[PDB]
Amino acid sequence: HGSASFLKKTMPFKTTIEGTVNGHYFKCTGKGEGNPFEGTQEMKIEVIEGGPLPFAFHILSTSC
Amino acid sequence: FLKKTMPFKTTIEGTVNGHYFKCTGKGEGNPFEGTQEMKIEVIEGGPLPFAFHILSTSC
């Protein structure tokens, strides 16, 4: 690719999540952006069904 | 609400090792004798690429 000047600096992403935890159904959407080669990213996740979540969001962190 | 012979029906949706599938099923049993039998049909993702046995406890 010659140099970093020819790589995409940032890439956006979108998410849909549907699940059931301990019998509780929920659905989320999310939107974010990251830097593919610097290995950094951030997103916003919104619970659209089943909120407020009756369990710690942390169990979803590696999935979102 | 329970009788000595009772029918049941099932819908199953799953992904196993990346393979999506859907099933329907129909059966009948004797709730008090503890016996039952059902027919399960794979309606999407057939023929299943894995042993049906892993779904036995979920029908």
Place this chain on the structure above:
Amino acid sequence: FLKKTMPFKTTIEGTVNGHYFKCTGKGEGNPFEGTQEMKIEVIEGGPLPFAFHILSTSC
């Protein structure tokens, strides 16, 4: 070599969570009826700082 009533004896040496202990035991049972009873004595490291129950399957 097996009789309808048979005695047994045990020696146990162990460490649990850093705690060393030794036991001896003597019992008797009926091998064909599948029943037995024994007395276990802690000879070193007593009184045990943990529930005896974790040793039950090892006597």
Place this chain on the structure above:
Amino acid sequence: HGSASFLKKTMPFKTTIEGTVNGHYFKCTGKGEGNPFEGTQEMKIEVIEGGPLPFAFHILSTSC
């Protein structure tokens, strides 16, 4: 301690190991030396009963 000049550079060690793996009894002795603050060490382990070992030594590596 002021400076590294006042730390012990190397420390020796000795080991005795006794065990049973899949019904096989064995006993080992060992001797080594390491550098406590550089975090490096090496040892020689000798099987004195139950040799040659009928299983991979590797299962003993974190114990020796």
Place this chain on the structure above:
Amino acid sequence: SKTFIKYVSGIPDYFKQSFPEGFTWERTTTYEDGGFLTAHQDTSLDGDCLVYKVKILGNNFPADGPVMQNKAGRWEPATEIVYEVDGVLRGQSLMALKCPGGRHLTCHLHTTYRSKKPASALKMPGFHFEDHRIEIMEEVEKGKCYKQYEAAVGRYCDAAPSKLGHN
């Protein structure tokens, strides 16, 4: 399909007690060769007919294993231990899939059963065993149609009695 169990020895029936509301169950099965099979199930009663809705996620099954090779034999009968926790019922069992070469591929089921009735409306069973014998009666069409039978019994350990009055 837990409504179909013969309970002996006066053991209360958590599943039959849950009607007309029904119940759910949730389970992860851990296989000894690295596979996992997770399921969530809803059981309802629609007039005269029981209705099951099942969601399944299975993963990490080895490509060379009996499951992904579709070279499994049959399940041995299984014995689940069932007991109250957190005002619902827990179950666990060890199951064994007989496979070619005299192999048994074992797995560990971890289950929670959740009545849709409140716990205060239920007579909860004490610790007990639930035996389940599952048999594939026919593979009607390869990978597409199966017939499966189950017989199940809720019981205490009758074979080896207590000397202290315990179930």
Place this chain on the structure above:
Amino acid sequence: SKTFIKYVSGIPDYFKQSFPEGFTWERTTTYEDGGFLTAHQDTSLDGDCLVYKVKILGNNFPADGPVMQNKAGRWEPATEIVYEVDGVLRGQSLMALKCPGGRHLTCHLHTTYRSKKPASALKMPGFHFEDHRIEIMEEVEKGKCYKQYEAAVGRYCDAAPSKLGHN
């Protein structure tokens, strides 16, 4: 103490067959709260008396748990699955220690039984169940002297029969 089992239904007795040579067993028990209890045992016959030599390593039991607090109740009966692997016998079971507060502290036993006779001298049992009921009959001296009873039975799943002729 596997010589003391009542086998029903014609199931061969791996343990009684092993005499006069005897047998060994080895086990790791995994507890659900992080403890492990590993043991190796030798069983021999010295004239008229069975002799057991046991080595135990237990670790990682939580300081606040029923085991290290010595606040355990009693074992429920347990059902082991037992089957041939590698020309010896494997066993696995789930056991449940009843504890204060309506708790069950469960664990998973992983066992290998090794006859001192060669496999070619033995009639190996097919897959079956071994029920064990263990009862502390008395704690004679706190932390120092116990009396323990066990009843055990080797059997098939009699409660739920096969439609295909299987044990």
Place this chain on the structure above:
Amino acid sequence: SKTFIKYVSGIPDYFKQSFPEGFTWERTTTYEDGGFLTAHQDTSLDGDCLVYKVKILGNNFPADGPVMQNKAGRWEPATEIVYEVDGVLRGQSLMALKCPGGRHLTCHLHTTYRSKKPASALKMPGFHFEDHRIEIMEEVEKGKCYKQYEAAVGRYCDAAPSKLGHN
């Protein structure tokens, strides 16, 4: 969200090599207190935008534990081992939730990553580590809105080098 990793030391990037077709992943996370969290995910590229479709089944979380009590804290950084098996990549890691007060609740992730390209079109990475730093930067609402950051690096064990030229 495995497209966003900085790979050092020349380690091939399985995820970036998978486009435009994309990849899937699948995971079961086993918590030390009995919870299971299972997921399947599809990753696609829609023009310039990555699209993730996630299915989740979680079960057996204790009512009294940090998860169901919504009293977690924050994840420690995590180090995954990633290596080829069956022509796909496996990963495993130990993660730890630092709960209010300082106690850690640990769990074990078991993952398979599956390119939508055939393995013959891919340069597979050797065994290596993937560090992941996850920070839940704001809980905007409830219960209901969260902002999460991650930094990830694929690397070898540079802190404790080989004396023999191994990675």
Place this chain on the structure above:
Amino acid sequence: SKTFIKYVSGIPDYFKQSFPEGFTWERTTTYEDGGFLTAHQDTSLDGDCLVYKVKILGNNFPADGPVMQNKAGRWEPATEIVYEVDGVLRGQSLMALKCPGGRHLTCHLHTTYRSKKPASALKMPGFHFEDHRIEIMEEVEKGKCYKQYEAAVGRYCDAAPSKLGHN
């Protein structure tokens, strides 16, 4: 042999702080193919020389697996998470044996480290990583004589830093 660790970033050294009294450790390693290896170790200081006393019980290793076939290869470097619980230190790691041909056999280490000093005399380290590079540098004889090197570093996750000042 935990006395030989290079701690960076100001992380307290639980092992060196424990002398002259010493420390013990205890571990069960669970292999993915069913093996268990359990150990207890005592570490003392005799004048200028460290003295280790180790007890081992291993079981359930499959007859056909890399361990009983003595067809391992070499360990990958390993990263342990180390953190305080119950006023002692816990550790866990995932290790991987790279077997001839390139397949990895994995295992999970569960450790407790116990100073012979009371926790009140010790500065406890926070959650951190301990990398261990183990190289079996020569198999001198059989079966019978081995030379093993290790390099170890205690560190934080520096490759993927926090945006908030966390270690």
